[PDB]
Amino acid sequence: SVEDRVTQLERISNAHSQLLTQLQQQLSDNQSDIDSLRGQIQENQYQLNQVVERQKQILLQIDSLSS
Amino acid sequence: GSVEDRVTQLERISNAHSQLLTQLQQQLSDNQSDIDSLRGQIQENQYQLNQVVERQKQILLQIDSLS
Amino acid sequence: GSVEDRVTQLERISNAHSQLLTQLQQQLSDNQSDIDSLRGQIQENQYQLNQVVERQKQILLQIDSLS
Ligand code: NA
């Protein structure tokens, strides 16, 4: 039963090896996924910045026009 | 020190690992879900932003006429 | 090999798995932390966009007074 118990451990060890390598691959792909999302959020923030800045100029242009 | 002590200890660690691996799979799934969700949220934000940029371009032509 | 060798080998693999497990836990926490930070940021970009939308409506009314 020590042999059967060692045999069971080698079996579970093999499954743990396979799963750990699968998880490593997924974790690294997800890190890459997140990089793409962060890049897009940044790009969008820059775009919102540009809109806001131009709104400030528009408001001032309206003030100039009003006189 | 007996082989029995050691397979005892290996069964203990193996079960710890089994538990940690489940926890890891559960939290990875959550994270991959969050990745998909944030992707959706970005896309909806980019679209609304596209529309604001375009409304500003329309505003800027009204201002030009008045200048 | 003997039960004794098989055990020694399981012990080397079990140690390897503990190390990898610790590393994958850390990379999953990193991905979670990144997600929660980006969630915060997109919410803030949406909050600003909403303000920009209402400002465009106010700009239109002001442009209207000018003609
Ligand atoms: Na505007």
UniProtKB/Swiss-Prot annotation, chains B, C:
GO cellular component: outer membrane-bounded periplasmic space; protein-containing complex
Keyword entries, A-Z: Cell cycle, Cell division, Coiled coil, Periplasm, Repeat, Signal, TPR repeat
Top-level taxon in the UniProt lineage: Bacteria
Subcellular location: Periplasm
Record carries keyword Signal: yes
A single GO BP: FtsZ-dependent cytokinesis
Coiled coil stretches, renumbered: 9-53
Disruption phenotype: Deletion mutant is sensitive to multiple beta-lactams, including cefsulodin. It leads to defects in outer membrane integrity, envelope defects and elevated cell lysis.
Record's subunit section: Homotrimer. Interacts directly with the central domain of TolA and with PBP1B. Binding to TolA disrupts the homotrimer to form a YbgF/TolA heterodimer with weak affinity. Forms a quaternary complex with PBP1B-LpoB and TolA.
Family: Belongs to the CpoB family.
Function: Mediates coordination of peptidoglycan synthesis and outer membrane constriction during cell division. Promotes physical and functional coordination of the PBP1B-LpoB and Tol machines, and regulates PBP1B activity in response to Tol energy state.
Domains as described in the record: Contains an N-terminal coiled-coil domain and a C-terminal TPR domain, separated by a flexible linker. The N-terminal domain forms a stable trimer and controls the oligomeric status. The C-terminal domain, which can also trimerize, is involved in interaction with TolA.
Protein's recorded name: Cell division coordinator CpoB
Species of origin: Escherichia coli (strain K12)
Lineage, uppermost ranks: Bacteria, Pseudomonadati, Pseudomonadota, Gammaproteobacteria, Enterobacterales
